[PDB]
Amino acid sequence: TTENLYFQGAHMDIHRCRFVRYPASAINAVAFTHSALPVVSSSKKYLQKNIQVRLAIGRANGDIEIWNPLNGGWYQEVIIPGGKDRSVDGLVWVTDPDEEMADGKIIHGKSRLFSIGYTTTITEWDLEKARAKKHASGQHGEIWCFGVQPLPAAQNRKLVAGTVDGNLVLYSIEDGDLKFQKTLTRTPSKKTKFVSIAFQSHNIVIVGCSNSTICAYDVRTGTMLRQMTLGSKNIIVWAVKCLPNGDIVSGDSTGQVCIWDGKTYTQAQRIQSHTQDVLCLSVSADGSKIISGGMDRRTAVYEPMAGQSGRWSKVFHRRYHQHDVKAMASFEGKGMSVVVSGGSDASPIVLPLRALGKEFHRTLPHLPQHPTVLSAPKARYILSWWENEIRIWHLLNKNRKFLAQVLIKGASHITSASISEDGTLLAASTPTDVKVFHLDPAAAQRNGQLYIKKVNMTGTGLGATRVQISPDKRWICWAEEGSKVMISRVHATESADGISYTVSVPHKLHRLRRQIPKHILLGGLGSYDRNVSQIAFSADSRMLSVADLAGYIDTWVLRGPAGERWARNPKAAMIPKLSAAPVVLSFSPTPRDDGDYDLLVVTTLKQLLIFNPLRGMLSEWSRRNTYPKLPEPFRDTRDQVKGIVWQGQRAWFYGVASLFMFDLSQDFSAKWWHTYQFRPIMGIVPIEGIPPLEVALIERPLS
């Protein structure tokens, strides 16, 4: 339960905590913005720099996570919240062709994301607002599968969905909308389910069924062109894919992977590859590799049989996951060649397509990139949240006490929370609300927990994606729908009762306009990367900074004489743009002699930078201690930093499986230290009782 680190005078006293039962949600769906990018040479590499490849991961709890593959440094960027009685069962990206403007500038095709969730509704997601963009339903059964019709027209794209009562339905996503368009087919039997879908060409849809059949349908007419029969009369074809040559690969409930000739629609081959249901398939872009995953937890790899034309041989199988393999998808481009699989064990697993089965796979964290753990250091509270409940514990100065379970009502999960250092002011957000609470350690209920008082806060009803209370408890800053920065004054009133809190109406804080060419803004993910990932106050609560995924840092200063106002930091525009997304944004608590601040940043590329924001520039320390001088273990981009803990002028940085300590009063060339003994880390948070440091280190192992 306890550990103690000592590095050349610095003591860290650790409470090793495993009692925060952060739940794992199964991965049900995996999908890339692009399956494949065109091959280009080093001379033409710069023609793909502005293409934005993202991975979407859909969870059983309805969460949708946007990941950036970052040439192997996988980084979880944004989590769009699910909600009570919501689940994601399928994901589809629709990415337009690139388009050349009259002046020869390339607009990279825009990417739109849709999902289905065991209902009659298809949902399109607003990546720019991290919330639902539109819902569309029709009179048909629950949708069990869907896909986008491939291009042969390009300005009038179509989705085809199969339902549980055996209907193909067509949805139009024309001119940026989403609506039910037409029912194509009604199977004779309402017990026949359409469970998997793939396109063989623009007009021919392949559908796996629950009645031991695979059917080919013409998209224009709805006519059944070909029926393929398997085997029982209840063989479920959970997965169908088409090879580049038009051949069909199927995976079914009996554990078989079958190959069907694309022209005759006859069974060319049967491979008894799994011992339980085959749930998912993946095919490489060149059609030379097939991947399958099953309820038997195994992943299998197939390659073309030497000599024999159009037939396949199983190369190997291996258990990568701890539970079933529910979904997988491949990406090939910019030197990357991977398949990503997922299942009930909640970890995404990345296999390198060019070196399968050689122990080069990677298991990505099952814990969110955001720590999702907080402390109130002066109160010795530790806090976490998931779904729609906040849990609060007290580490006694029977060293544990469960203080409160705060319920946040809403159709969606909590997106963010913040607590004051003394544990009396608590804030939490959803996409529809920003909620504020007043905590009194003397206010108890019969169930033993704290009595939590609501603090009135009026708002736009657009909620927030991140929320942050200032250290002096006078301000609450949040990011509304990712891109808009808001701030409210927290008014404390004293009386015989003690303190009572009220909150002002939100005030808008304006970020700098950035110079981004119109061909970049109009393509790919639009303004998705302006999503604010960090909000940071300085220790004196007189400066405020935010940074977004694109790497822009905005700064405000508090002007004294409610005679106070937040104003634009005069030298804000001089702060450079980061070349990679910030994972940490933190004001050093140590005052500077020149009255400026040390604003520290860590990026996904493991850059470590300190800016002096009032002067508007990189600090002298950063000018000496550049990237090549950082310790080689720290520069490993497979080790993503999640958080920071200050110890005076020493800074501690942790990832999911790593802990570093740098003495920032010193220059690099040893005076830096690290350890890998802690894993898997949710977060490390200080508590109060060379200054020694006392922290709660929260680990959340699954297996």
Author numbering: -10 to 141, 148 to 226, 233 to 398, 415 to 578, 610 to 717, 824 to 843, 855 to 868
Would you copy out the relevant sentences from the publication that reported this structure?
The earliest intermediate is the huge 90S pre-ribosome or small-subunit processome (SSU) that is co-transcriptionally assembled in the nucleolus by incorporation of several modular subcomplexes onto the nascent pre-rRNA. The UTP-A complex is presumably the earliest complex that associates with the nascent 35S rRNA and binds to the 5'-end of the 5'-ETS up to the binding site for the U3 3'-hinge. Utp4 is positioned in the center of the UTP-A complex and scaffolds large parts of the 5'-ETS. The UTP-A subunits have been shown to be essential for biogenesis of both the 40S and 60S subunit and have been linked to pre-rRNA transcription and are hence also termed t-UTP proteins.
The crystal structure of Utp4 was solved at a resolution of 2.15 Å by the single wavelength anomalous dispersion (SAD) method using seleno-methionine labelled protein. Utp4 comprises two 7-bladed β-propellers (numbered 1 to 14) with four strands (A, B, C and D) per blade. The overall architecture reveals the two propellers to be arranged in an orthogonal manner with the side of the N-terminal β-propeller 1 packing with β-strand 1D against the top of the C-terminal β-propeller 2. The first loop between β-strands 2A and 2B of β-propeller 1 forms an extended β-hairpin that packs against an α-helix presented by the opposing loop that emanates from β-strands 10D and 11A of β-propeller 2. A long Chaetomium thermophilum specific C-terminal insertion between β-strands 13C and 13D (residues 717–825) is not resolved in the crystal structure. Most prominent, residues at the very N-terminus constituting the first β-strand form a basic surface patch, which is also conserved. For Utp4 we observe an uncommon Velcro-closure for the most C-terminal blade 14 of β-propeller 2. While the N-terminal β-propeller 1 forms a continuous domain (residues 38–381), blade 14 is completed by parallel β-augmentation of the very N-terminus of Utp4 (β-strand 14C) and the N-terminal TEV cleavage site (anti-parallel β-strand 14D) introduced during cloning. In particular, a network of salt-bridges between conserved residues (R5-E864, R7-E864) help in stabilising the Velcro-closure suggesting a highly specific arrangement. We thus postulate, that the articifial β-strand from the TEV sequence present in our crystallized Utp4 construct mimics the physiological Velcro-closure in trans by Utp8.
